[PDB]
């Protein structure tokens, strides 16, 4: 099944017993995020 | 004079600082991959040769 998916990266570590369901394209670069897929922003949910 | 896949330009590089951030903040190359490590933290956790 391809439905079960995890998080590849985000801003920092998670506080214990905390859930993050955000789908915003994580900005892994100094270039400001354009809100879509590119060379610095990737979809956090892998 | 880029080499071919059968015979590479074997560059054994040694003690120095490799600024992965320089190659990571610039999109001159089409694709950059690094095994299990974000490029930025590549400048913090270091290795031998």
From Swiss-Prot, chain A:
Q: What does changing residue 5 to R do? A: In strain: Delta/B.1.617.2, Epsilon/B.1.427/B.1.429, Kappa/B.1.617.1, Lambda/C.37, 19B/501Y, Omicron/BA.4, Omicron/BA.5, Omicron/BQ.1.1; Contributes to cellular immunity evasion and increases infectivity
Please describe, based on the UniProt annotation, the reported consequence of changing residue 37 to D. Answer: Increased replication in human TMEM106B overexpressing cells
| Effect after changing residue 6 to F | Decreased HLA binding to NF9 epitope. Increased binding affinity to human ACE2
Summarizing the annotation, the consequence of altering residue 6 to F is: In strain: B.1.1.298
Q: What is the effect of changing residue 9 to L?
A: In strain: Omicron/EG.5.1
Outcome when changing residue 13 to K? In strain: Omicron/BA.2.75, Omicron/BQ.1.1, Omicron/XBB.1.5, Omicron/EG.5.1
Which consequence is recorded for altering residue 37 to A? In strain: Omicron/BA.1, Omicron/BA.2, Omicron/BA.2.12.1, Omicron/BA.2.75, Omicron/BA.4, Omicron/BA.5, Omicron/BQ.1.1, Omicron/XBB.1.5, Omicron/EG.5.1
Question: Where are the stretches annotated Immunodominant HLA epitope recognized by the CD8+?
Answer: 1-9
| Residue span of region Receptor-binding motif | 1-46
S-S bonds:
33-41
Disordered: region residues = 8-43
> What is the purpose of this protein?
Attaches the virion to the cell membrane by interacting with host receptor, initiating the infection. The major receptor is host ACE2. When S2/S2' has been cleaved, binding to the receptor triggers direct fusion at the cell membrane. When S2/S2' has not been cleaved, binding to the receptor results in internalization of the virus by endocytosis using host TFRC and GRM2 and leading to fusion of the virion membrane with the host endosomal membrane. Alternatively, may use NRP1/NRP2 and integrin as entry receptors.
Name of the protein this chain belongs to: Spike protein S1
Q: Which gene encodes it?
A: S
Summarize which stretch of the complete protein this chain spans: 448 to 493 of 1273
